[PDB]
Amino acid sequence: MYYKDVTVSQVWFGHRYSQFMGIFEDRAPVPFEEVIDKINAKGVCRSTAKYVRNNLETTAFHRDDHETDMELKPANAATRTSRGWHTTDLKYNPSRVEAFHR
Amino acid sequence: MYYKDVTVSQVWFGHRYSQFMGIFEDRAPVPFEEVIDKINAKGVCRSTAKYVRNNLETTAFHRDDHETDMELKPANAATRTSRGWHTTDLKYNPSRVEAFHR
Amino acid sequence: ITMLEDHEFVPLEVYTRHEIKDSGLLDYTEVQRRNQLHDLRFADIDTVIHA
Amino acid sequence: LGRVAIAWCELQNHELTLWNEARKLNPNAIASVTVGRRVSARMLGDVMAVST
């Protein structure tokens, strides 16, 4: 399975300390050309995910930066886990700025 | 299980009538110290939830008010239901103000 | 007159409980285990970023 | 069935005396039946002498 867990979160940065306001977790497919070229051959994956949700075409950029190809790396081994893989281990969250819904 | 059902909702308030735009339902853990002191001994619980989700520390204040120690009360008995407990029975929603995303 | 010979009845069953359980396409226990360990395996559930 | 077989062996070994007496009585018939073919027997003495 070659999918990109596109997740976006809206966060309230309060007058003193932060707070979530929703995390849209989504699973997104990847193009055949992406799988053939970057995944299988070069062992990397793009920072963007071009896919069709809700009868609309959308792309999400990892960390909301410009397009880049992260080096695909194995996932940390837990109990009774097969061989998985993921480009990113952490999850990007907006930088804290006062009284803004980021 | 000691968890706080942190639910936040964005509601459109039209000129004539209201409308939802998302309900971020979430289950949040509670600190060991909170369970030991306020839950087991005093039988109460805080109106806040200090927990780390999506690699970020977030809190939600019940009814978006200042922190208070809500009195835990038993849940209404339904069919084939064991003993549960919950501090709040209703769910807070923003007060209606015209043409605002509250 | 000849005595009836001793016979041993070995355990026999076309469908053991393991393969009967595996007959179903999806097992809720395995599916939930994989889906809930997904977050732990493919993300860090302990690292906290503050800025 | 083992009890039946034991009782049958005992029955044969026990009717052997009746069969000796019957040989002394009617040697022709007894010898014919024992052999399986109609034969004529004579004074056995201690063993039947037969003739087809």
Curated annotation (Swiss-Prot), chains A, B:
Domain of life, per lineage: Viruses
Outcome following mutation: residue 17 to S: Complete loss of fusion with host cell
Residue numbers spanned by region Involved in fusion and/or binding to host membrane: 11-17, 96-102
Post-translational modification: The cytoplasmic tail is phosphorylated by the viral kinase US3. Phosphorylation may be linked to a down-regulation of gB expression on cell surface. ubiquitinated.
Subcellular location: Virion membrane; Host cell membrane; Host endosome membrane; Host Golgi apparatus membrane
Function summary: Envelope glycoprotein that forms spikes at the surface of virion envelope and binds to the host cell entry receptors MYH9/NMMHC-IIA and MYH10/NMMHC-IIB, promoting the virus entry into host cells. Essential for the initial attachment to heparan sulfate moieties of the host cell surface proteoglycans. Involved in fusion of viral and cellular membranes leading to virus entry into the host cell: following initial binding to its host cell entry receptors, membrane fusion is mediated by the fusion machinery composed at least of gB and the heterodimer gH/gL.
Protein family per UniProt: Belongs to the herpesviridae glycoprotein B family.
Subunit details: Homotrimer; disulfide-linked. Interacts with host receptor MYH9/NMMHC-IIA. Interacts with host receptor MYH10/NMMHC-IIB. Binds to heparan sulfate proteoglycans. Interacts with gH/gL heterodimer. Interacts with the host coreceptor PILRA.
Record-given protein name: Envelope glycoprotein B
Organism per entry: Human herpesvirus 1 (strain KOS) (HHV-1)
Name of the gene encoding the protein in the UniProt record: gB
Curated annotation (Swiss-Prot), chain D:
Subcellular location: Virion membrane; Host cell membrane; Host endosome membrane; Host Golgi apparatus membrane
Domain of life of the native organism: Viruses
Modification after translation (UniProt): The cytoplasmic tail is phosphorylated by the viral kinase US3. Phosphorylation may be linked to a down-regulation of gB expression on cell surface.
Subunit structure: Homotrimer; disulfide-linked. Interacts with host receptor MYH9/NMMHC-IIA. Interacts with host receptor MYH10/NMMHC-IIB. Binds to heparan sulfate proteoglycans. Interacts with gH/gL heterodimer. Interacts with the host coreceptor PILRA.
Role description: Envelope glycoprotein that forms spikes at the surface of virion envelope and binds to the host cell entry receptors MYH9/NMMHC-IIA and MYH10/NMMHC-IIB, promoting the virus entry into host cells. Essential for the initial attachment to heparan sulfate moieties of the host cell surface proteoglycans. Involved in fusion of viral and cellular membranes leading to virus entry into the host cell: following initial binding to its host cell entry receptors, membrane fusion is mediated by the fusion machinery composed at least of gB and the heterodimer gH/gL.
Family: Belongs to the herpesviridae glycoprotein B family.
Name recorded for this polypeptide: Envelope glycoprotein B
Source organism: Human herpesvirus 1 (strain KOS)
Residues of the full protein shown: 521 to 572 of 904
